[PDB]
A = this chain, B = another copy of it.
Amino acid sequence: PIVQNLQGQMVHQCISPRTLNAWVKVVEEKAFSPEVIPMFSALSCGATPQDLNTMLNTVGGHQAAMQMLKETINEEAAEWDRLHPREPRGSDIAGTTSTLQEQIGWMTHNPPIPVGEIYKRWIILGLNKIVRMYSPTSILDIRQGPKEPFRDYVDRFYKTLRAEQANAATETLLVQNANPDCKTILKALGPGATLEEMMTACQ
């Protein structure tokens, strides 16, 4: 990673072992749950492309999703080569034809060229694709059970939505696919009600 010294000078700090193990464990547990994308963005704060490639390589398993991310990176890197015809190229930003010297030289410059933050965008885009492919249920099938507390139903509704679109139609659909015991109370509250009101009434 690249952090600033006590002398206010951007230097290349080594990737911390706590961040390495944290990222591997996140994938081992959450396994592409929507919160893995923010956890990757935060654990890769100011990371050179070499560091991003190291974090992705330590991912144990899920190799199918990794090739899909690799293809997404390849597509985005080529698009960078078109919109921007020394200048960094898509291969330099992805860490394939760039040295750590070149990556640091691009990041610690005035004006800077954040080859690490650009690469993190490409990674987050492909990772967002992986969360949609991994979403087991569609929002059209999230329907409140007979004895399911309304909080638990909304817990599944907005998680499924956070993975699919990784909209007032969600408001109509949430009531439309709700238990009748609660659906009557939801119509009682009337249109345009705070989610706090809906869940307070169906308690």
Q: Does A118 contact B (CB under 8 A)?
A: no
CB-contacts of A53-82 with B (<8 A): 53-54, 57-64, 66-68, 71-72
17 contacts between A and B (CB under 8 A): A5-B8, A18-B18, A20-B39, A20-B42, A35-B58, A38-B54, A61-B155, A63-B154, A63-B155, A63-B161, A64-B158, A64-B195, A67-B158, A67-B195, A71-B196, A133-B196, A136-B203
Q: How many residues on A have C-beta within 8 angstroms of the other chain's C-beta atoms?
A: 66
Q: Does A19 contact B (CB under 8 A)?
A: yes
**Complex: how many Å from CA A158 to CA B13?**
31
Which A residues are closer than 8 A to B by beta carbons? 1, 3-9, 11-22, 24-25, 30, 33-35, 37-39, 41-43, 45-46, 53-54, 57-64, 66-68, 71-72, 129, 133, 136, 151, 154-155, 157-159, 161-162, 194-196, 199-200, 203
